Design a protein around this ligand. Sequence first.
Ligand SMILES: OC[C@H]1O[C@H](O)[C@@H](O)[C@@H](O)[C@@H]1O
Ligand SMILES: OC[C@H]1O[C@H](O)[C@@H](O)[C@@H](O)[C@@H]1O
Ligand SMILES: OC[C@H]1O[C@H](O)[C@@H](O)[C@@H](O)[C@@H]1O
Ligand SMILES: [Ca+2]
Ligand SMILES: [Ca+2]
Ligand SMILES: [Ca+2]
Ligand SMILES: [Ca+2]
Ligand SMILES: [Ca+2]
Ligand SMILES: [Ca+2]
Ligand SMILES: [Ca+2]
Ligand SMILES: [Ca+2]
Ligand SMILES: [Ca+2]
Ligand SMILES: [Ca+2]
Lengths: 146, 145, 146
Amino acid sequence: QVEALQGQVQHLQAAFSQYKKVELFPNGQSVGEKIFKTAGFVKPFTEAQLLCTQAGGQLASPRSAAENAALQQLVVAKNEAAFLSMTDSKTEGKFTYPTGESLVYSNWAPGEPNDDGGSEDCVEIFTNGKWNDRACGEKRLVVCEF
Amino acid sequence: VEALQGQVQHLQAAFSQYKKVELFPNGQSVGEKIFKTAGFVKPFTEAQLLCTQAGGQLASPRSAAENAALQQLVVAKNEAAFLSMTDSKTEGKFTYPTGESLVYSNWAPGEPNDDGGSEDCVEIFTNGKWNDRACGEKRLVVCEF
Amino acid sequence: QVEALQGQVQHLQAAFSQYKKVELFPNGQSVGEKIFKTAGFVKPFTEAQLLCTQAGGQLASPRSAAENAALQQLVVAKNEAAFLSMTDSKTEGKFTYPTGESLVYSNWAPGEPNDDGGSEDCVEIFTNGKWNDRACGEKRLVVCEF
Ligand SMILES: OC[C@H]1O[C@H](O)[C@@H](O)[C@@H](O)[C@@H]1O
Ligand SMILES: OC[C@H]1O[C@H](O)[C@@H](O)[C@@H](O)[C@@H]1O
Ligand SMILES: OC[C@H]1O[C@H](O)[C@@H](O)[C@@H](O)[C@@H]1O
Ligand SMILES: [Ca+2]
Ligand SMILES: [Ca+2]
Ligand SMILES: [Ca+2]
Ligand SMILES: [Ca+2]
Ligand SMILES: [Ca+2]
Ligand SMILES: [Ca+2]
Ligand SMILES: [Ca+2]
Ligand SMILES: [Ca+2]
Ligand SMILES: [Ca+2]
Ligand SMILES: [Ca+2]
């Protein structure tokens, strides 16, 4: 019986693995156990953030060079800089994930973050993978992670 | 017979993650039903063909809960969508594709009104309310699975 | 534990069967054990090929009338001719799959392939389903198989 129930499960694993690859083409990227997926359009930080959380995930939060490179592929493909989840709204100069935890990785472009105009508390990632603090009111590519 | 339970556990976790990814950003889950928009507009007939060939049917909200779920997609695309119901067989009596009569409705004030004497299809607005409309018009294609 | 486990697998099978239909709508077509999926946009051959391979698949390669007809439904729906994976770049006049093996099926339009202008080594499929050898530098609908 187990011999049969397992043949059912392994058949399922096979079909599921194929559908996973199909799902990620062409708006997603898998890295480790995390999955980045772009919505394809642009929006202000607040709305971008609400879209991701309501979908059961959150805004892209690269925690390593590999994750950042994975996210960059999506930005490059859509040719639109994207918003990350991190902000320094609570304490100027100190960026944190939505959980309040401090960054464990960063890829700031030379000269950033600079809080230009005295009001750049959000983060965007360029097609070259570098980060820049930007005003939360600007519209950027929406990319969520799951 | 335990390493098999380990596989099922891994599958449940992975499949659960994949479901969320799939629904973003064009689908809405509610109960055992799934609404998904194609992202473009089409006349009723073509819109209906697209859903049936895909193994489903045009959105058919049967409760305040399903309508709210469907409303989220319409609002997201800012484009009214077609429902599956029509009164083309018997004017004034809207039915599902199967044939049964509506078990739920959310008509806007004064609707349905067969305006111009030619509105046998139904569209749902960004506000969730329904309006009977000419089937030849082009509206957001949303199917249910 | 079996009865409780048989219930889980049954639930998984039911949920998966539903999600396969959801996934294929509206850019995919399933035929046999193969799945065709269009990215929705056009690109030259080299760019198209890279996109599919990096996603873990390859450009559409219909190996039968059934597969070709399924691929045709996508091209018709997007109203855009697509690139297939085969080319005769190595040996002029001899089309092969990415693996180098010879074609086991073809659906050439009358008179094709004609290596027009002596520079057509790629293949495109029209909305009517026929094939035509074309210059790889042209932009065509991107469709991958998994
Ligand atoms: O528009 C804001 C933007 O302007 C320039 O590009 C730079 O000073 C950036 O650091 C800054 O974020
Ligand atoms: O244009 C048709 C449309 O006009 C108005 O919006 C209303 O009378 C609707 O009931 C009707 O369907
Ligand atoms: O030149 C592009 C195209 O022109 C005509 O349609 C035919 O000769 C085709 O074989 C050729 O590929
Ligand atoms: Ca999908
Ligand atoms: Ca500040
Ligand atoms: Ca700041
Ligand atoms: Ca800056
Ligand atoms: Ca009528
Ligand atoms: Ca009517
Ligand atoms: Ca009306
Ligand atoms: Ca040649
Ligand atoms: Ca040639
Ligand atoms: Ca030719």
